Amino acid sequence: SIPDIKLSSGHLMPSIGFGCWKLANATAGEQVYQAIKAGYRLFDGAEDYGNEKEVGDGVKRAIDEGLVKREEIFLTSKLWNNYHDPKNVETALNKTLADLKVDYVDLFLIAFPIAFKFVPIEEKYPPGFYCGDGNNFVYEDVPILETWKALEKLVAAGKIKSIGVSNFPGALLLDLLRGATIKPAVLQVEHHPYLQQPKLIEFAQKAGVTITAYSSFGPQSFVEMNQGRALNTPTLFAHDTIKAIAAKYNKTPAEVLLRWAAQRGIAVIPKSNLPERLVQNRSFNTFDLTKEDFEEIAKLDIGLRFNDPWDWDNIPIFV
Amino acid sequence: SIPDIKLSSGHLMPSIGFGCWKLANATAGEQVYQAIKAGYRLFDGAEDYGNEKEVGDGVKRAIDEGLVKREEIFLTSKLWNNYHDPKNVETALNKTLADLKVDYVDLFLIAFPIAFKFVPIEEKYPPGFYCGDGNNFVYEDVPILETWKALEKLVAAGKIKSIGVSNFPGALLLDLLRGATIKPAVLQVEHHPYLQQPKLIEFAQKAGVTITAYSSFGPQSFVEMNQGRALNTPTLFAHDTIKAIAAKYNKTPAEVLLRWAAQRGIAVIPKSNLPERLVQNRSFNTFDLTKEDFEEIAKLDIGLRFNDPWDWDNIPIFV
Ligand SMILES: NC(=O)c1ccc[n+]([C@@H]2O[C@H](COP(=O)([O-])OP(=O)(O)OC[C@H]3O[C@@H](n4cnc5c(N)ncnc54)[C@H](OP(=O)(O)O)[C@@H]3O)[C@@H](O)[C@H]2O)c1
Ligand SMILES: NC(=O)c1ccc[n+]([C@@H]2O[C@H](COP(=O)([O-])OP(=O)(O)OC[C@H]3O[C@@H](n4cnc5c(N)ncnc54)[C@H](OP(=O)(O)O)[C@@H]3O)[C@@H](O)[C@H]2O)c1
């Protein structure tokens, strides 16, 4: 029932998956297990989410019970910023594989086009913004392409099925395409009605790169982090445009928010700590938005970005 | 006074220069020569402007008459898109040197982070959007860094004093800084009240990169090009904010738009076919805008870009 998208690498990736960012290590495993029971098969994780061991626990529990087999689960992980130096790429991946308790990850992405100074895993993991010098941000001169080649080798060694990038703007994706032997199969970016970036989406899809949207619910995911911007932002759930469209089809605002992406060939990975939202967040493909619907939602695009490295240390990724 | 800016390469660059874009071939020489008599010393040219030979004619005349010596003139040129393949970089630079009738250029920039398929000089020069196949755009897989390394070798060989980039967004500049041995000394970008990109400017300047603004008058330069966008844009000269400030100081709106950039350490290269505009464009450093002025002008930033490759062939440089 969840349509699959055939990636450029030839592998199928579920168009709807379960987001694992901010799932408490306390209930993460149980919730991953429940999501599997609710039909989810793709799990979007990351070294920086700090809960890959638990994600691995949920998946393994489901495999041991005979509910699914490894090959039916799609595991996405992301290489954190401290591990871009080629000599450290496989190290990070091994940690991810060890934590997930598997021999390969289906998709491995470069989390950000940012290279923090390397911090040994034994000194601090996940490292977050720590760069080995107190609270100071420190960077390494590792061009994107160097990191990418190291990933290409790891695909050849069979530790990764498909590789891609996250948080890459157009100019950077274009340059990477010029040097890539294995084309980035996926581009994962913040994507919701307040940040539509239609030209980026268009370019990538035409280039055969599949888009996975994150934070489809806009500011929602960020208010629990006490982020001023998200808190000052009117929710999409109570937004008149979204509510009117939802009423029109007798659907929930959440369903409209997810279908808006899904209908345009964009994969989604809604995250939820609430059991009842599990089925709801993957059963929204029951109606079609009209061109007029899309034009009305288009008016919400204001370029409001919630996940911006500029906030961390004025890193110019999106300027 | 025309203050000099010390570039990261150790060389001085006049903070005020003369743009050569769309300077007609029949009069370019005279125009450059008059510019020199009026005190200009930096000339912003480019292979794609197709008038480098005539710009060279003007400079040579001024030198032959004794008005200036070569070392007193700062010549900037740009590597067009069809010449990014490392093996074509020196041949393009050599065509520029032969046209300008000089042994070295003071600044040579990558015109765009775009790589068009090589087209022999003998076949078409300047090539413009022609890519060797009718009206079809055809690109080469040449990563920015490869082109950059070719430029570094030309500096070592003494054919270029300082190198830089044009039309590079933040993420791309950042990545280039990771692989560069000679750091790009300059970032030349479209810069005016409608497209302020304050974060790009701040990052570049903090990174020690000098900013050269182009199209300081916004839509104006693109008007004679019959560009839809520019034609439908309320001018900056007539914008109430700019008018009020110009009136307040008894300066033309043009003087305010140039000083607005200059006071913030940004170099300008105003282009003008008229004599009085020529002198005014080099004599506006006689007043300082106040913090309130800057705050009022800051309000115009709507991110309106007139020079966007997206319009050529949906090239994602700025998305
Ligand atoms: N590559 C990157 O940089 C990056 C960054 C951010 C996110 N991501 C990935 O994308 C995933 C999804 O994005 P996200 O987690 O940031 O935010 P999201 O999925 O848009 O956030 C969902 C937020 O809304 C609530 N919610 C979930 N389903 C709902 C529903 N049906 N109705 C009303 N509210 C609902 C959740 O609360 P409850 O949990 O209480 O239900 C949660 O606070 C992440 O988990 C992660 O895997 C990647
Ligand atoms: N790197 C790049 O991609 C790029 C792209 C564009 C430009 N550039 C460089 O930047 C230079 C300047 O940019 P630009 O020529 O596009 O835009 P600009 O300098 O803003 O163009 C000035 C336009 O405004 C008029 N003008 C000049 N001085 C004036 C004054 N004092 N009062 C009122 N109007 C005035 C000119 O008309 P008249 O000639 O009739 O006086 C001309 O049409 C170029 O020549 C080129 O060297 C680089």
Side-chain angles (χ1 to χ4, degrees), chain A residues 125-147:
Chain A
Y125 188 85
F129 299 143
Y130 179 64
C131 296
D133 177 33
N135 299 313
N136 295 311
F137 282 91
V138 184
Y139 304 103
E140 312 193 303
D141 293 328
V142 180
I144 295 304
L145 190 57
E146 289 306 300
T147 304

PDB file of all heavy atoms in Angstrom, chain A residues 125-147:
ATOM      1  N   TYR A 125      30.536  10.481  21.669  1.00  0.00           N
ATOM      2  CA  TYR A 125      29.659  10.044  20.608  1.00  0.00           C
ATOM      3  C   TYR A 125      28.203   9.971  21.065  1.00  0.00           C
ATOM      4  O   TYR A 125      27.913   9.393  22.104  1.00  0.00           O
ATOM      5  CB  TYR A 125      30.088   8.677  20.101  1.00  0.00           C
ATOM      6  CG  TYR A 125      29.321   8.279  18.877  1.00  0.00           C
ATOM      7  CD1 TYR A 125      29.731   8.702  17.612  1.00  0.00           C
ATOM      8  CD2 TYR A 125      28.138   7.531  18.981  1.00  0.00           C
ATOM      9  CE1 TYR A 125      28.997   8.397  16.482  1.00  0.00           C
ATOM     10  CE2 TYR A 125      27.384   7.217  17.848  1.00  0.00           C
ATOM     11  CZ  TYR A 125      27.824   7.654  16.602  1.00  0.00           C
ATOM     12  OH  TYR A 125      27.103   7.342  15.477  1.00  0.00           O
ATOM     13  N   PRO A 126      27.278  10.606  20.323  1.00  0.00           N
ATOM     14  CA  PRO A 126      27.470  11.385  19.088  1.00  0.00           C
ATOM     15  C   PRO A 126      28.163  12.679  19.502  1.00  0.00           C
ATOM     16  O   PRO A 126      27.955  13.152  20.611  1.00  0.00           O
ATOM     17  CB  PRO A 126      26.036  11.667  18.608  1.00  0.00           C
ATOM     18  CG  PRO A 126      25.173  10.691  19.369  1.00  0.00           C
ATOM     19  CD  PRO A 126      25.852  10.540  20.693  1.00  0.00           C
ATOM     20  N   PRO A 127      28.970  13.286  18.618  1.00  0.00           N
ATOM     21  CA  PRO A 127      29.629  14.526  19.053  1.00  0.00           C
ATOM     22  C   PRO A 127      28.820  15.826  19.001  1.00  0.00           C
ATOM     23  O   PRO A 127      29.181  16.807  19.664  1.00  0.00           O
ATOM     24  CB  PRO A 127      30.875  14.577  18.165  1.00  0.00           C
ATOM     25  CG  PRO A 127      30.358  13.957  16.881  1.00  0.00           C
ATOM     26  CD  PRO A 127      29.597  12.762  17.391  1.00  0.00           C
ATOM     27  N   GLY A 128      27.737  15.854  18.227  1.00  0.00           N
ATOM     28  CA  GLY A 128      26.960  17.087  18.141  1.00  0.00           C
ATOM     29  C   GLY A 128      27.843  18.216  17.608  1.00  0.00           C
ATOM     30  O   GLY A 128      28.553  18.040  16.620  1.00  0.00           O
ATOM     31  N   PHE A 129      27.835  19.369  18.262  1.00  0.00           N
ATOM     32  CA  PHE A 129      28.664  20.471  17.800  1.00  0.00           C
ATOM     33  C   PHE A 129      30.070  20.500  18.358  1.00  0.00           C
ATOM     34  O   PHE A 129      30.850  21.379  18.018  1.00  0.00           O
ATOM     35  CB  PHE A 129      27.983  21.798  18.088  1.00  0.00           C
ATOM     36  CG  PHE A 129      26.672  21.941  17.405  1.00  0.00           C
ATOM     37  CD1 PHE A 129      25.608  22.581  18.031  1.00  0.00           C
ATOM     38  CD2 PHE A 129      26.505  21.471  16.116  1.00  0.00           C
ATOM     39  CE1 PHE A 129      24.395  22.750  17.362  1.00  0.00           C
ATOM     40  CE2 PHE A 129      25.302  21.634  15.449  1.00  0.00           C
ATOM     41  CZ  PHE A 129      24.248  22.270  16.063  1.00  0.00           C
ATOM     42  N   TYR A 130      30.405  19.541  19.210  1.00  0.00           N
ATOM     43  CA  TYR A 130      31.743  19.492  19.781  1.00  0.00           C
ATOM     44  C   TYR A 130      32.799  19.256  18.698  1.00  0.00           C
ATOM     45  O   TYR A 130      32.704  18.320  17.911  1.00  0.00           O
ATOM     46  CB  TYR A 130      31.823  18.382  20.842  1.00  0.00           C
ATOM     47  CG  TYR A 130      33.202  18.259  21.457  1.00  0.00           C
ATOM     48  CD1 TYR A 130      33.755  19.302  22.208  1.00  0.00           C
ATOM     49  CD2 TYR A 130      33.958  17.103  21.275  1.00  0.00           C
ATOM     50  CE1 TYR A 130      35.046  19.187  22.767  1.00  0.00           C
ATOM     51  CE2 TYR A 130      35.232  16.970  21.821  1.00  0.00           C
ATOM     52  CZ  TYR A 130      35.772  18.013  22.568  1.00  0.00           C
ATOM     53  OH  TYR A 130      37.031  17.858  23.111  1.00  0.00           O
ATOM     54  N   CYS A 131      33.822  20.093  18.663  1.00  0.00           N
ATOM     55  CA  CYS A 131      34.852  19.937  17.658  1.00  0.00           C
ATOM     56  C   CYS A 131      36.227  19.765  18.285  1.00  0.00           C
ATOM     57  O   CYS A 131      37.232  20.168  17.689  1.00  0.00           O
ATOM     58  CB  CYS A 131      34.866  21.146  16.715  1.00  0.00           C
ATOM     59  SG  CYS A 131      33.361  21.353  15.753  1.00  0.00           S
ATOM     60  N   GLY A 132      36.268  19.205  19.493  1.00  0.00           N
ATOM     61  CA  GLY A 132      37.546  18.964  20.148  1.00  0.00           C
ATOM     62  C   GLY A 132      38.222  20.132  20.840  1.00  0.00           C
ATOM     63  O   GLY A 132      39.348  20.003  21.304  1.00  0.00           O
ATOM     64  N   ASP A 133      37.549  21.274  20.913  1.00  0.00           N
ATOM     65  CA  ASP A 133      38.143  22.428  21.560  1.00  0.00           C
ATOM     66  C   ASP A 133      37.093  23.159  22.367  1.00  0.00           C
ATOM     67  O   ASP A 133      36.631  24.227  21.974  1.00  0.00           O
ATOM     68  CB  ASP A 133      38.751  23.355  20.511  1.00  0.00           C
ATOM     69  CG  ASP A 133      39.314  24.623  21.116  1.00  0.00           C
ATOM     70  OD1 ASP A 133      39.808  24.544  22.262  1.00  0.00           O
ATOM     71  OD2 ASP A 133      39.272  25.691  20.454  1.00  0.00           O
ATOM     72  N   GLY A 134      36.703  22.572  23.493  1.00  0.00           N
ATOM     73  CA  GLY A 134      35.698  23.200  24.338  1.00  0.00           C
ATOM     74  C   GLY A 134      34.425  23.455  23.557  1.00  0.00           C
ATOM     75  O   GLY A 134      33.948  22.562  22.863  1.00  0.00           O
ATOM     76  N   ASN A 135      33.877  24.662  23.661  1.00  0.00           N
ATOM     77  CA  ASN A 135      32.662  25.000  22.940  1.00  0.00           C
ATOM     78  C   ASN A 135      32.939  25.612  21.577  1.00  0.00           C
ATOM     79  O   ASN A 135      32.006  26.047  20.909  1.00  0.00           O
ATOM     80  CB  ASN A 135      31.815  25.999  23.732  1.00  0.00           C
ATOM     81  CG  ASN A 135      31.369  25.456  25.081  1.00  0.00           C
ATOM     82  OD1 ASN A 135      30.890  24.316  25.186  1.00  0.00           O
ATOM     83  ND2 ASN A 135      31.508  26.278  26.122  1.00  0.00           N
ATOM     84  N   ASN A 136      34.206  25.652  21.166  1.00  0.00           N
ATOM     85  CA  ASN A 136      34.570  26.253  19.875  1.00  0.00           C
ATOM     86  C   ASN A 136      34.297  25.397  18.652  1.00  0.00           C
ATOM     87  O   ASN A 136      34.548  24.198  18.654  1.00  0.00           O
ATOM     88  CB  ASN A 136      36.058  26.636  19.841  1.00  0.00           C
ATOM     89  CG  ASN A 136      36.407  27.726  20.839  1.00  0.00           C
ATOM     90  OD1 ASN A 136      35.739  28.754  20.910  1.00  0.00           O
ATOM     91  ND2 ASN A 136      37.460  27.502  21.614  1.00  0.00           N
ATOM     92  N   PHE A 137      33.786  26.018  17.599  1.00  0.00           N
ATOM     93  CA  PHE A 137      33.563  25.287  16.362  1.00  0.00           C
ATOM     94  C   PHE A 137      34.899  25.261  15.633  1.00  0.00           C
ATOM     95  O   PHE A 137      35.572  26.284  15.537  1.00  0.00           O
ATOM     96  CB  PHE A 137      32.532  25.991  15.477  1.00  0.00           C
ATOM     97  CG  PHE A 137      31.121  25.782  15.917  1.00  0.00           C
ATOM     98  CD1 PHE A 137      30.520  26.662  16.806  1.00  0.00           C
ATOM     99  CD2 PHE A 137      30.392  24.691  15.440  1.00  0.00           C
ATOM    100  CE1 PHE A 137      29.192  26.465  17.221  1.00  0.00           C
ATOM    101  CE2 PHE A 137      29.080  24.476  15.837  1.00  0.00           C
ATOM    102  CZ  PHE A 137      28.469  25.373  16.737  1.00  0.00           C
ATOM    103  N   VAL A 138      35.286  24.092  15.142  1.00  0.00           N
ATOM    104  CA  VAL A 138      36.532  23.942  14.401  1.00  0.00           C
ATOM    105  C   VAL A 138      36.207  23.081  13.182  1.00  0.00           C
ATOM    106  O   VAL A 138      35.494  22.068  13.291  1.00  0.00           O
ATOM    107  CB  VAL A 138      37.627  23.266  15.258  1.00  0.00           C
ATOM    108  CG1 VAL A 138      38.936  23.217  14.490  1.00  0.00           C
ATOM    109  CG2 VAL A 138      37.810  24.037  16.575  1.00  0.00           C
ATOM    110  N   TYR A 139      36.745  23.487  12.037  1.00  0.00           N
ATOM    111  CA  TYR A 139      36.507  22.838  10.752  1.00  0.00           C
ATOM    112  C   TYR A 139      37.725  22.182  10.095  1.00  0.00           C
ATOM    113  O   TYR A 139      38.859  22.531  10.411  1.00  0.00           O
ATOM    114  CB  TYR A 139      35.923  23.895   9.811  1.00  0.00           C
ATOM    115  CG  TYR A 139      34.677  24.542  10.388  1.00  0.00           C
ATOM    116  CD1 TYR A 139      34.725  25.826  10.951  1.00  0.00           C
ATOM    117  CD2 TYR A 139      33.458  23.843  10.426  1.00  0.00           C
ATOM    118  CE1 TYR A 139      33.578  26.406  11.546  1.00  0.00           C
ATOM    119  CE2 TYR A 139      32.307  24.403  11.013  1.00  0.00           C
ATOM    120  CZ  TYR A 139      32.375  25.675  11.568  1.00  0.00           C
ATOM    121  OH  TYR A 139      31.261  26.202  12.157  1.00  0.00           O
ATOM    122  N   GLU A 140      37.483  21.241   9.180  1.00  0.00           N
ATOM    123  CA  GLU A 140      38.554  20.550   8.452  1.00  0.00           C
ATOM    124  C   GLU A 140      38.405  20.861   6.976  1.00  0.00           C
ATOM    125  O   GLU A 140      37.282  20.955   6.464  1.00  0.00           O
ATOM    126  CB  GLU A 140      38.465  19.013   8.542  1.00  0.00           C
ATOM    127  CG  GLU A 140      38.269  18.412   9.885  1.00  0.00           C
ATOM    128  CD  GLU A 140      38.517  16.927   9.882  1.00  0.00           C
ATOM    129  OE1 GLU A 140      37.857  16.196   9.111  1.00  0.00           O
ATOM    130  OE2 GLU A 140      39.381  16.497  10.661  1.00  0.00           O
ATOM    131  N   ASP A 141      39.535  20.971   6.286  1.00  0.00           N
ATOM    132  CA  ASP A 141      39.530  21.243   4.855  1.00  0.00           C
ATOM    133  C   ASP A 141      39.341  19.977   4.046  1.00  0.00           C
ATOM    134  O   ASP A 141      40.283  19.447   3.440  1.00  0.00           O
ATOM    135  CB  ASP A 141      40.821  21.938   4.447  1.00  0.00           C
ATOM    136  CG  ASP A 141      40.927  23.330   5.029  1.00  0.00           C
ATOM    137  OD1 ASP A 141      39.879  23.986   5.193  1.00  0.00           O
ATOM    138  OD2 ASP A 141      42.053  23.775   5.311  1.00  0.00           O
ATOM    139  N   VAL A 142      38.113  19.474   4.051  1.00  0.00           N
ATOM    140  CA  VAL A 142      37.814  18.259   3.305  1.00  0.00           C
ATOM    141  C   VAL A 142      36.733  18.575   2.276  1.00  0.00           C
ATOM    142  O   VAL A 142      35.563  18.731   2.637  1.00  0.00           O
ATOM    143  CB  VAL A 142      37.297  17.116   4.247  1.00  0.00           C
ATOM    144  CG1 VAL A 142      36.986  15.855   3.420  1.00  0.00           C
ATOM    145  CG2 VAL A 142      38.345  16.795   5.330  1.00  0.00           C
ATOM    146  N   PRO A 143      37.101  18.691   0.987  1.00  0.00           N
ATOM    147  CA  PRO A 143      36.041  18.989   0.011  1.00  0.00           C
ATOM    148  C   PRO A 143      34.982  17.902  -0.060  1.00  0.00           C
ATOM    149  O   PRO A 143      35.279  16.720   0.119  1.00  0.00           O
ATOM    150  CB  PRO A 143      36.793  19.105  -1.314  1.00  0.00           C
ATOM    151  CG  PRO A 143      38.172  19.609  -0.878  1.00  0.00           C
ATOM    152  CD  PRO A 143      38.442  18.776   0.372  1.00  0.00           C
ATOM    153  N   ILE A 144      33.750  18.308  -0.345  1.00  0.00           N
ATOM    154  CA  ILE A 144      32.658  17.357  -0.485  1.00  0.00           C
ATOM    155  C   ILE A 144      33.046  16.127  -1.311  1.00  0.00           C
ATOM    156  O   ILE A 144      32.835  14.990  -0.883  1.00  0.00           O
ATOM    157  CB  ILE A 144      31.417  18.006  -1.182  1.00  0.00           C
ATOM    158  CG1 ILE A 144      30.835  19.118  -0.308  1.00  0.00           C
ATOM    159  CG2 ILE A 144      30.331  16.962  -1.397  1.00  0.00           C
ATOM    160  CD1 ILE A 144      30.479  18.629   1.076  1.00  0.00           C
ATOM    161  N   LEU A 145      33.614  16.347  -2.495  1.00  0.00           N
ATOM    162  CA  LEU A 145      33.959  15.228  -3.380  1.00  0.00           C
ATOM    163  C   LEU A 145      34.846  14.169  -2.741  1.00  0.00           C
ATOM    164  O   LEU A 145      34.701  12.983  -3.035  1.00  0.00           O
ATOM    165  CB  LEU A 145      34.605  15.740  -4.673  1.00  0.00           C
ATOM    166  CG  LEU A 145      34.783  14.684  -5.766  1.00  0.00           C
ATOM    167  CD1 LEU A 145      33.424  14.043  -6.117  1.00  0.00           C
ATOM    168  CD2 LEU A 145      35.408  15.361  -6.995  1.00  0.00           C
ATOM    169  N   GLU A 146      35.760  14.582  -1.869  1.00  0.00           N
ATOM    170  CA  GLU A 146      36.613  13.616  -1.176  1.00  0.00           C
ATOM    171  C   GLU A 146      35.721  12.690  -0.322  1.00  0.00           C
ATOM    172  O   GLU A 146      35.856  11.470  -0.350  1.00  0.00           O
ATOM    173  CB  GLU A 146      37.620  14.343  -0.287  1.00  0.00           C
ATOM    174  CG  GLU A 146      38.696  15.050  -1.073  1.00  0.00           C
ATOM    175  CD  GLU A 146      39.364  14.091  -2.022  1.00  0.00           C
ATOM    176  OE1 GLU A 146      39.928  13.095  -1.518  1.00  0.00           O
ATOM    177  OE2 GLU A 146      39.309  14.303  -3.261  1.00  0.00           O
ATOM    178  N   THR A 147      34.796  13.276   0.425  1.00  0.00           N
ATOM    179  CA  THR A 147      33.904  12.483   1.258  1.00  0.00           C
ATOM    180  C   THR A 147      33.096  11.555   0.354  1.00  0.00           C
ATOM    181  O   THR A 147      33.012  10.356   0.605  1.00  0.00           O
ATOM    182  CB  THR A 147      32.969  13.409   2.062  1.00  0.00           C
ATOM    183  OG1 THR A 147      33.762  14.323   2.823  1.00  0.00           O
ATOM    184  CG2 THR A 147      32.091  12.618   2.995  1.00  0.00           C
TER     185      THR A 147
END
